[PDB]
Design a protein around this ligand. Structure first.
Ligand SMILES: CC(C)C[C@H](N)C(=O)O
Length: 1273
């Protein structure tokens, strides 16, 4: 039964590793046309097919690979066997009698048979060709070959030779082709190499790589499936020349150039200079002297890792890349999945870059003069393997293609990427010696959009001291209440006078301009009078928090140069033992009334200091920021983030040492509102706060985020009378904001973000929507006098949507840090996009959302990438702080001699919680990659001087904590699937977290194991995808989250309505079909199931609908075989106790008995001709089979429009129900009922049933329903 004899054998040899993998893929996963290439060539002209066949047979002799077949069945290592002679035939077909469309349809038909047919590498010639005659000089030509013996590059050499021969033979002319070095020579080379050394090289290359999701923030996560989509573009002719000429003067490939510019582009999307992507390489090693003319498999996809060192330029980068290209050459035979199997990274590479050496498309279509025919078109079949592919081929102006999965990426994004690539190509090559980090990558349209389009408008209005704005508010209505504390209220008049008095006494004692005045007040009326007096005297105030330690005050005193100190009397221990030999004056003091209650005429410059408050940033001692009159005008005047008025009553709950208070005081007092100052003991006390709010009729308030959440958890009454609630300081807690929103309504909650150095907040998000699918609350849009720029480290504008350092400019930017020119120069810079202005570098990370609001991404100094996931280390810290009974906790990240980082948690507690207590909590609270790897317990954390944060050197964690609990199969599933692993790897005692390749696994077994689940004791799953899923847990994850029937698998349509219907599948077995029916079901939400092939499929639906709808009247559906399924379903419902309102059968009847299996599954698929097509036979085979071999629910049948004679083994449902068996006649025969215009007539009727409409309700039943739906809230 062997198809060949020993005589036929000319030679034999072993397979390249790549080949070897392709072969096994084939054996185990045939039909999936992974390695089938198919090139269609549109040929216009005269074609001697006979001569072309003969010419193909010459090529057949010329190249061993075409006479090669493979042996694998019973043999330790597979073998390639070259045969002496194989005769090639071109299937010739005439379609001249058909229409254009008909010809096209037939050819598309041949192609699809061809794609599923594949090759049998045991026997077939691994290439075939069909030629279709469309008209007299019009042909379409379909070549097909298996990748196991050729790559695209080779293919062209073959076609070139085919045509020299072709042209020679048809003119009866001699010819000569050069000697061809056999593919066997590459195998010999390959056999001289050390596979483990090559593996080592890659492992070292990728050592310490922290992984990458390219364009992570732009990716859509919605349902799977590839939606192929394409964007063709090219630079200018000039741009292409300078590009091309630069690659040469630097002596590198066009390919390497392209990858250099790409690296810089993704550099700006990944927040990183350690970068990776796939590249296709020639696989043709220098050391085989004529390697460049051999024909067979060489090309390979391999990873490129690029490290953009500080200051690296383009030419530096080119050098870098060309250099490692060489180093890699001897190792390109290693299959990518072996490169990954030892790597650390699942998502190692994400996307790939191709510069097709010389495309089959562009190269082949040249001079019909010699060939006698024109190849008008060429078209290769491309298998969408990555979600984004950059591909380029040379030309006068270079042809670039971004080929992508639009289920993942928006065309809008691929469009921006295009223009950023084009800008990249220009700027990089124009400026090939500048640090790459310095190059600009945004076009003018985008640059304008980002700077101008995303920021507020330019405003005229400008500038006037606070004293002036205050005079405005006072003159408005002197009798209006201005200030209140503990009952005692003051009018704008009274407050003004008490402040003029204080402004004069100050001015007398030599405060004036250029000095700082130290406030030392507990919250009181005086506090506020102090502030005004200081401003009115032309000075700057320094709030001193009475609760601070003596020595932190003494620092602030000296540093600020505070010439004077202004106090209280309940603070009469301003003596205490501070000390302070400066002048100190009380506004307790009754001697104040001696001076005038008119103000002085204190000429003030807006840009002069208004105040100083210190913050902790400069790890060590705290730093004073200088805030300005004009600064403060920016926050409160000419701003359209809502408007405050004479009619508002503010409550200040913010300590006057923090610039939240500057909002409290200035937003009220400069809009003529009432300011209520909460007493010290009310600040963090939600009951007092709620009462003060209630008794004072407060309508506006700023709370820290912690207080806001605190209040929100305590009660609702406090918020019910508020018209506006600002909060900020930490990341908004969405659950809490969602709670506030529902009580308060939209336009009320405002989330505010800002460093001190930007004066309180630079952006604000007024909450209106709160989408159920909401990760983090935006920090919104800049306030009217501020600007925001998302920049890289070198002040380059990031792509719209990329993460970068949030920088601020506009009126709010402070005059910098007291006595510290070094720090000011570091954080504060000249605004590159606006002469005259200053830019503050916040240290925070952010991106613009598509809506122009801003999403906060954490601190630069608090980031860690794990498994391609940017992790914010403060988000895990806060989860530890909240865990009942915790006290302190910090999290460091470190890597060893590699770059391969991990996260250690540290906790002080006592002896309350054991080590794993904390781990159990985070397990489900936080995602897996954010869970710390150790949990060292301390009495306390080290500090270093003024250190809320700690002396980083905590102890290197104890390694017992690396040893964790072995967890063997949890269920009967994993046991049997751990059985095959055990069998395959030949190793006992495997836990569900053990690595397959770490256990001795490799290429074949990874497949061979995924095969044993694929039938032979199993149930089928992706083969080359245990490299994907190396842990049994990860594969239980793949097949429970994305396996069969669950949250994703059984189709849903019409989501944001309500009224559920529960469909059942037709004979073919898939709910995807009623998708086309869902449209004509406008109000009803659909559950389109699949067919479950198991005998106890009964209980699976019993579990499914119980989840999807727990109680009430149930409505089932069934078309075709889905009927007797849906009946054998409601019986169980009401057997297990669940009321079914009604069922709607559609042209299918009762099983009153029983009556070939595959041929009629094929014959009925022949009246119905991978994701939807792969498992289509073996499921339809079983459901069609299941078919051939009472309930309380009302049944409604919609019958065919065609007449019908009933079998004895079929019958009406009349008997099969106790209730109303109503029924109607539809339009269309059994097939066409649920497709086309016939479906749309059958729809209206399906209402009539579901409609019913009359459905007479009782008054008690109606009222109750109403009050029921209401209480829901
Ligand atoms: C976010 C900013 C408004 C800062 C403010 N001082 C706060 O407590 O949140």
């Amino acid at each position: 039964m062997s198809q060949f004899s020993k005589d036929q054998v000319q030679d034999m040899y072993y397979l390249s590793p790549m080949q070897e993998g392709m072969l096994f893929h084939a054996i185990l996963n045939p039909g999936q046309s992974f390695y089938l290439e198919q090139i269609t060539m549109k040929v216009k002209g005269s074609l001697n097919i006979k001569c072309l066949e003969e010419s193909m047979n010459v090529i057949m002799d010329r190249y061993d690979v075409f006479r090669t077949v493979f042996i694998h069945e019973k043999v330790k290592r597979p073998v390639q066997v070259v045969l002496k002679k194989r005769q090639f035939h071109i299937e010739e077909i005439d379609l001249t009698h058909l229409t254009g469309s008909e010809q096209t349809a037939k050819i598309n038909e041949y192609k699809e048979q061809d794609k599923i047919r594949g090759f049998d590498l045991t026997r077939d010639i691994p290439m075939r060709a069909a030629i279709f005659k469309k008209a007299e000089e019009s042909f379409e030509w379909v070549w097909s070959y298996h990748h196991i013996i050729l790559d695209g590059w080779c293919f062209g050499i073959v076609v070139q030779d085919l045509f020299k021969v072709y042209n020679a033979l048809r003119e009866q002319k001699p010819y000569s082709l050069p000697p061809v070095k056999p593919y066997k020579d590459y195998i010999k080379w390959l056999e001289k190499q050390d596979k483990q050394a090559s593996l080592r090289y890659w492992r070292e290359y990728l050592e310490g790589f922290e992984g990458q999701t390219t364009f992570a923030e732009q990716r859509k996560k919605q349902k799977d499936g590839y939606e192929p989509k394409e964007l063709l573009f090219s630079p200018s002719e000039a741009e292409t020349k300078a590009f091309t000429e630069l690659a040469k003067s630097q002596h590198t490939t066009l390919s390497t150039a392209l990858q250099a510019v790409w690296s810089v582009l993704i550099s700006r999307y990944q927040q990183s200079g350690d970068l990776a992507f796939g590249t296709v390489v020639s696989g043709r090693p220098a050391e085989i002297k004529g390697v460049e003319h051999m024909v067979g498999l060489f090309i390979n996809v391999v990873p490129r890792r690029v490290k953009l060192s500080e200051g690296i330029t383009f030419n530096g980068l080119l050098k870098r890349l060309q250099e490692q290209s060489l180093q890699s050459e001897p190792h390109q035979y290693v299959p990518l999945y072996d490169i990954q199997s030892q790597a650390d990274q699942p998502k190692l590479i994400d996307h790939i870059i191709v510069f097709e050496n010389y495309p089959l498309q562009d190269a082949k279509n040249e001079e019909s003069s010699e060939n006698g025919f024109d190849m008008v078109d060429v078209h290769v079949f491309e298998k969408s393997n990555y979600d984004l592919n950059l591909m380029a081929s040379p030309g006068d102006e270079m042809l670039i293609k971004l080929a992508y999965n639009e289920n993942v990426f928006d065309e809008a994004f691929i469009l921006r990427l295009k223009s950023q690539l084009l800008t990249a190509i220009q700027q990089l090559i124009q400026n090939p010696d500048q640090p790459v980090s310095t190059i600009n990558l945004v076009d003018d349209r985008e640059r304008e959009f980002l700077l101008t389009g995303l920021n507020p408008p330019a405003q005229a209005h400008e500038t006037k001291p606070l004293t002036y704005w205050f005079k405005e508010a006072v003159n408005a209505n002197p009798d209006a209440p201005a200030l209140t504390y503990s009952g005692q209220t003051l009018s704008y008049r009274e407050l003004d006078e008490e402040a003029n008095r204080i402004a004069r006494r100050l001015q007398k004692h030599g405060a004036g301009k250029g000095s700082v005045v130290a406030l030392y007040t507990k919250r009181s009326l005086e506090l506020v009078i102090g502030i005004l007096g200081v401003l009115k005297a032309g000075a700057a105030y320094l709030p001193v928090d009475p609760k601070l330690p003596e020595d932190r005050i003494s620092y602030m005193l000296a540093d600020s140069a505070a010439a004077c100190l202004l106090t209280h009397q309940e603070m009469k221990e301003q003596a205490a033992e501070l000390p302070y030999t400066g002048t100190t004056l009380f506004i307790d003091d009754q001697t104040r009334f001696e001076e005038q209650a008119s103000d002085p005429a204190t000429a003030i410059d807006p840009n002069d200091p208004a105040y100083i408050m210190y913050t902790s940033g400069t790890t060590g001692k705290p730093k004073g920021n200088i805030t300005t009159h004009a600064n403060i005008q920016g926050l409160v005047k000419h701003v359209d983030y809502m408007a405050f008025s004479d009619q508002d009553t503010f409550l200040s709950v913010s300590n006057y040492a923090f610039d939240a208070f500057t909002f409290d005081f200035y937003a009220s007092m400069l809009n003529a509102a009432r300011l209520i100052i909460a007493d010290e003991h009310t600040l963090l006390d939600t009951e007092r706060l709620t009462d003060l709010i209630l008794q004072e009729n407060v309508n506006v308030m700023f709370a820290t985020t912690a207080l806001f959440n605190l209040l929100t958890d305590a009660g609702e009454d406090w918020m019910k009378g508020l018209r506006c609630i600002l909060f900020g300081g930490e990341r908004a807690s969405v659950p809490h904001v969602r709670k506030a929103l529902r009580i308060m309504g939209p336009g009320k909650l405002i989330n505010c973000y800002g460093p001190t150095e930007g004066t309180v907040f630079a952006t604000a998000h007024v909450v209106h929507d709160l989408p159920d699918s909401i990760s983090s609350l935006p920090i919104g849009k800049p306030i009217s006098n501020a600007s925001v720029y998302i920049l890289n480290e070198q002040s380059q504008l990031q792509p719209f949507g990329a993460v970068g350092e949030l920088c601020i400019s506009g009126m709010g930017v402070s005059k910098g840090y007291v006595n510290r020119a070094d720090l000011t120069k570091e954080k504060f810079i000249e605004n590159p996009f606006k002469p005259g202005e200053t830019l503050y570098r916040t240290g925070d990370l952010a991106r613009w959302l598509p809506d122009g609001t801003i999403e906060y991404a954490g601190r630069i100094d608090d980031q860690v990438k794990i498994r391609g996931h940017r992790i914010e280390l403060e988000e895990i810290e806060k989860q530890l702080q909240e865990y009942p009974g915790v006290k302190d906790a910090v999290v460091v990240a470190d890597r060893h001699e590699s770059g391969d980082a991990s996260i250690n948690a540290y906790l002080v507690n006592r002896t309350q919680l054991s080590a794993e207590d904390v781990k159990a909590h985070l397990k489900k609270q936080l995602p897996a990659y954010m869970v710390p790897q150790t949990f060292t317990f301390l009495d306390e954390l080290p500090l270093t001087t003024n250190g809320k944060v700690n002396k980083r050197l905590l102890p290197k964690p104890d390694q017992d904590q690396l040893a964790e609990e072995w967890i063997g199969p949890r269920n009967e599933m994993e046991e049997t699937i751990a059985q095959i692993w055990s069998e395959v790897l030949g190793r006992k005692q495997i836990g569900i977290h053990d690595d397959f390749f770490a256990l001795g696994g490799h290429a074949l077994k990874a497949m061979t194991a995924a095969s044993r689940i694929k039938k032979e004791l199993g149930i089928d799953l992706p083969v080359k995808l245990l490299f994907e899923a190396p842990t049994i847990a990860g594969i239980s994850a793949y097949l429970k989250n994305g396996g069969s029937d669950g949250l994703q698998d059984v189709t849903i349509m019409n989501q944001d309505q309500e009224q559920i219907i529960f469909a059942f599948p037709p004979v073919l077995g898939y709910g995807l079909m009623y998708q086309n029916l869902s449209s004509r079901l406008p109000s009803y939400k659909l559950c389109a199931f699949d067919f479950i092939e198991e005998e106890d499929r009964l209980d699976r639906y019993a579990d499914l609908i119980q989840k999807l709808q727990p109680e009430g009247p149930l409505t089932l559906f069934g078309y075709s075989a889905g009927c007797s399924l849906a009946f054998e379903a409601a019986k169980k419902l009401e057997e297990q106790g669940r009321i079914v309102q009604r069922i709607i059968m559609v042209d299918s009847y009762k099983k009153q008995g029983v009556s070939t299996v595959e041929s009629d599954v094929e014959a009925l698929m022949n009246v119905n001709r991978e994701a939807v097509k792969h498992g289509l036979k073996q499921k339809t085979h079983a459901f069609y089979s299941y078919y051939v071999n009472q309930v309380k629910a009302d049944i409604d049948l919609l019958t065919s429009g065609a007449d019908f004679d009933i079998p004895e083994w079929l019958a009406s449902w009349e008997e099969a129900t106790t209730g109303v068996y109503r029924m109607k006649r539809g339009f269309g025969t059994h097939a066409e009922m649920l497709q086309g215009e016939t479906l749309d007539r059958n729809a209206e009727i399906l209402l009539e049933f579901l409609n019913t409409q009359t459905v007479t309700v009782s008054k008690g039943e109606f009222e109750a329903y109403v009050e029921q739906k209401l209480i829901s809230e």
